[PDB]
Amino acid sequence: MVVLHSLLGMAVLIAIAVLLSKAINIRTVAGAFLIQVALGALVLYVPQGRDMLGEASKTISNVIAYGNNGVDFLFGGLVSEKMFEVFGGGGFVFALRVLPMIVFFSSLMAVLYYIGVMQLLIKVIGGFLQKMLGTSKAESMSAAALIFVGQTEAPLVVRPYIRRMTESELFAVMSGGLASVAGSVLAGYVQMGVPLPYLIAASFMAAPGGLLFAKLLVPNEDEKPTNVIDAAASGAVTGAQIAIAVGASLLAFVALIAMINGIIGGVDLTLQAILGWLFSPLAWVIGVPWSEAGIAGSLIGQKVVINEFVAYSEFVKYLKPSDTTKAIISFALCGFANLGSIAVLVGGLSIMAPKRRKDVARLGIKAVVAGSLSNLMSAVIAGLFT
């Protein structure tokens, strides 16, 4: 029963990467992967690993509780338990919980960035990744942000250094951004599914894993605030208008998916089944049983287009009245990687520097294939330390 399937999966995923690729730095990819599996192995298993995991996340669980009280003020009782007594799970509103947090996380990080807390963490961790793997400063810094900040909140930092940056790290930022899980996606889980430490685990894995699959084939006046209030205010506004963009995209995509599902019925096999039939070997290789590869394959297919939420909902529907396939599908669900986030990031980076946005559209979905395979690698890794 000792897993060879795990190492088999890692062998295949890295092989496909080479097949899809070549002359890459081996000291970069072997080290990045080493860091990925080691960090994940230690924080999950060996002592002081999970003990720390609970302390630096229960603090975050309080940060989320602060955001709740912030929403409680603005939206009143709609975010109370009165909805659940009438509509129940239908009383759960997506736009009142998933979107408004973007505002807070944007403003809060704008404060941390103004002080130097974010720069500190990014400069230290960034210097670590560029020393152990011999990578450029830009990508190593951007990855560090994606651990703490979301995906759309990362280019806000690595903007000026991202000007003349090569396409090598460009794919790295976008692949890391999609694989990233903090702020707006960490959001969802804690307030609906409530896995407290899954927030930290998937986040810390996202950046180095992202810098791994991406590095497979890697190698005029403005104004700024004076005080902290300006930063907290400006960040909120930026996070607000971004939230309007996010929520609009999500409604549209889910709606178009309902359309592509309707056109297939016309032309009784749903698209969710087609995705579950096609991407079934990917689950078989990852370690998921063949008996549950048809269902989890759909969620993977839903992970391709739809956000991780609808796939998570259908997952919990299977949970409500195996442990290996559950966690394997859980960490696979963790990550903001989807066809939606690509478009949002492309629009965000287009606002940063459209002069390079022309050739910065060639990668596109390749970043999703990188961020997903990176996070899926992190999921298969979690199956090794169950």
Q: Which residues bind ligand 6ZL (CB under 6 A)?
A: 52, 55-56, 58-59
Binding partner of residue 259 among a copy of itself, ligand 6ZL, none, CB under 5 to 8 Å per kind? a copy of itself
The nearest distance, CB 60 to ligand 6ZL, in angstroms, is 7
Q: Residue 269, class by beta-carbon neighbours within 10 Å (0-12 exposed, 13-18 middle, 19+ buried)? A: exposed
CA-based radius of gyration for the chain: 20
The amino acid present at 237, given as its one-letter code, is V
244-255 burial code (b ≥16 CB/10 A, e <16): ebbbebbeebbe
Q: Smallest Cα–Cα separation from 309: which of 186, 183, 209? A: 186
The smaller minimum CB distance to ligand 6ZL, of residues 54 and 219, is found at 54
Positive or negative CA dihedral for 160, 130, 333, 103?
A: negative
Helix (H) or strand (E) holding 333: helix 323-333
User: Maximum Cα–Cα distance for the chain, whole Å?
Assistant: 63
* Cβ neighbour number for residue 265 with a 10 Å cutoff: 10
**Interface pick for a copy of itself out of 63, 132, 274, 278 (rule CB under 8 A):** 63
DSSP state of 82: T
Binding partner of residue 167 among ligand 6ZL, a copy of itself, none, CB under 5 to 8 Å per kind? none
Site string for a copy of itself, 92-111 (x = CB under 8 A): xxxxx---x--xx-xxx--x
**Interface pick for a copy of itself out of 2, 88, 317, 359 (rule CB under 8 A):** 88
The smaller minimum CB distance to ligand 6ZL, of residues 59 and 291, is found at 59
Binding partner of residue 338 among ligand 6ZL, a copy of itself, none, CB under 5 to 8 Å per kind? a copy of itself
Subset of residues 128 to 187 that bind a copy of itself, contact rule: CB under 8 A: none
- Please report whether residue 115 would count as binding a copy of itself according to CB under 8 A: no
The smaller minimum CB distance to ligand 6ZL, of residues 55 and 359, is found at 55
Subset of residues 256 to 275 that bind a copy of itself, contact rule: CB under 8 A: 256, 258-259, 261-262
Cα of first residue to Cα of last residue in the chain, in angstroms, is 13
Residue 71 CA from chain centroid, whole number: 23
Q: Are 335 and 180 in contact (CB under 8 A)?
A: yes
The smaller minimum CB distance to a copy of itself, of residues 193 and 347, is found at 347
Binding partner of residue 70 among ligand 6ZL, a copy of itself, none, CB under 5 to 8 Å per kind? a copy of itself
Site string for a copy of itself, 197-236 (x = CB under 8 A): --------------------------x-xxxxxx-xxxxx
Binding partner of residue 234 among ligand 6ZL, a copy of itself, none, CB under 5 to 8 Å per kind? a copy of itself
Binding segment (CB under 8 A) for a copy of itself, from list 46-54, 84-92, 150-158, 295-303: 84-92
- Please report whether residue 254 would count as binding a copy of itself according to CB under 8 A: yes
Q: Residue 128, class by beta-carbon neighbours within 10 Å (0-12 exposed, 13-18 middle, 19+ buried)? A: middle
